[PDB]
Amino acid sequence: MRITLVDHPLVQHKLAHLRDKRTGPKDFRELAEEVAMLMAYEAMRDLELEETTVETPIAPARVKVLSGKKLALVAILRAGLVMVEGILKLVPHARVGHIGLYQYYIKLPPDIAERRAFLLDPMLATGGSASLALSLLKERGATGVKLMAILAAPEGLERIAKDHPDTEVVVAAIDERLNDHGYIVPGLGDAGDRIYGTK
Amino acid sequence: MRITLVDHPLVQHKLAHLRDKRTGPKDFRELAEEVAMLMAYEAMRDLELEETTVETPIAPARVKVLSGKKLALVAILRAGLVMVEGILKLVPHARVGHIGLYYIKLPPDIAERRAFLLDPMLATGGSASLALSLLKERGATGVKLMAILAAPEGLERIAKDHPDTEVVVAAIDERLNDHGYIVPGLGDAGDRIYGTK
């Protein structure tokens, strides 16, 4: 299982502010969105292109545009929503799906088998939600799905490599462990609550 | 000289739409802002950091933070404005300067700030070179010049006048026609961004 760590200094810096317990919901949400955008640069380096011609105001021009259907961003409710908003600023034509667990709620774009797909899950703690989500996506015919997380715990990455080995995980950072209550350590607290002000 | 070609399919795709003469002002503006954002990812990969610790809701955490003052984004009017707007989405704390070629306003102590000069179209390199001089006179150092499209001409003008400056570009075009327009380029950046002519 490929684990891609986004290194950029802007990611590290913003991540420092996200962890800082003194950062309020407004800044936390904006930061989380910026991190998502930055991480998407890395996660989308391999987007396939095709050649075509275009007429500029000055003269004809050989150019390259993305091939196939519009990519799909799939958010794991609730915190995953913040990553979608961030990333849509980079790719506004992206189709969006949502998956909420506990039965489960799922809505995906049509023909997801012919779309590059990205699963957004801010905190990869135990990896259970991400795992199940990946299963639902595979089942619908999704392939080559990239799991994007801001923070990941060893226990979580292991969980994914164990159930979906052929999945790439893009993360800003890998922490030490999960505490007595299932939270990533040192992590940043409850992602959802810190994003929407629902402590 | 120092040149960095931004290599990302999103950039290639968006530049394709910018060049297409059918893309209207709204989409052009949004596209230019997105390209500016993407290009900023590379242009800022070398921002310096410094270690420190912070208290998370859960426990102490070792982290790295940007060092020094806040970075400066200097726009060359008018087209440069679109790039400032796009880039600010990534670094909203950045200080902004403006140069119109005549008029110039910059953040204080720019000599102590990582600076980025924004000029969508590096054609003859004339505007950008003058701007770099004005910036050098004011203590600016290690300036990266960011252009969407560049002509070999402008690149050579900058290599000759300011060999110290690094140039970040999205694509290097053929030449300049007998009207100073980049070929194949995309026309008048400003007019296409704002809907003028």
Add this chain to the structure above:
Amino acid sequence: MRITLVDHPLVQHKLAHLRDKRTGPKDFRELAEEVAMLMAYEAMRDLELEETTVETPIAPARVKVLSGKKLALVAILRAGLVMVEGILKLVPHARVGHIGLYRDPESLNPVQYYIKLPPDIAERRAFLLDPMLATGGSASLALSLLKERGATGVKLMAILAAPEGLERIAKDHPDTEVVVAAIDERLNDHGYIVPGLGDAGDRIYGTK
């Protein structure tokens, strides 16, 4: 029950573009955000203020600021999300809540799958967001969920509403104030607003 019909040229114009079936997800999502922003002007014109003073870089100044805790924006997933995003551009410090409900295609009744609200809800001005008020079943359930948790003076903001839906809320939650951009004709056999604009959610996120 009180209903506030929002009348503004930009809202009508954009609503025309939202209804047009030729409008794809990107533009539809942006239009919905803009409409929400515009409707927020009227729905928040009654926010309470209190006097205070600040130092200007020129001199002291007597000013007025909002009083009380930050307001709460509660979205009914999925379509409500777009309204919350647009409104946050005006009031970025607002706290956000989410109520997950999807309408059963057969019974046309709401199915709950999630709810999360800011704390001290009874102490904040509350706004419930969901673009389409059809039968009113989902909004009514949401209104109940908010009520049982202490919310009061709730303003339900919808872009389009069917008379049937308005009647359902007046019946179930008379104290609710409903702000809308337009009132349409009726619902069809499948529970869709006519002429309406189709399935908000699918048209916002490009789903089916």
Add this chain to the structure above:
Amino acid sequence: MRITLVDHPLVQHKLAHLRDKRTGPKDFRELAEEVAMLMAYEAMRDLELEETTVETPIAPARVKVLSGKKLALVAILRAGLVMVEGILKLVPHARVGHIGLYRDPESLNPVQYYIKLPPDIAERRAFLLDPMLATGGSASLALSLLKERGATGVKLMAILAAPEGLERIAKDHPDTEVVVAAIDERLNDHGYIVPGLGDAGDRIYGTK
């Protein structure tokens, strides 16, 4: 002359934070965009509409859309830029003009270093944006520029206006309609609005 005092709690509140000297460039910039958007709501209740039809996914619908060409937003650099950005969030298809003007810190008279306007501005609803209406010298010149190029029915939009500024515009361009967030006391020895909020441009971009 016609003066609209945008009266809305969100505007008063945000104005309070813009005035407060502790507000940094990032927040100041966001606040100005937000205030500009709220003000645009009033300034554009004016937009003429026309009747037409479209096909919704459900059925045909009679609707209304804006008539004529896209409206023009003309900013007075530098400070005007922030207002254009905020307002674009509501009307993204608007054409943007730019008039470069700065005030000689001596004669308090404006110096012109740039002007670019949308084509056929005579057939577009126009809005001139300049956060601070101090002596009014800048806005007055700007209005003269717009006038000679065919613009008419122009609404000058400012966040703060001083009496001497309104009088200057009332004197040079009486037909101009002004929309403001608040009218202040006077101008100090340096031409700054009292109590105002200091130098707008500098506070927006972090210059000095």
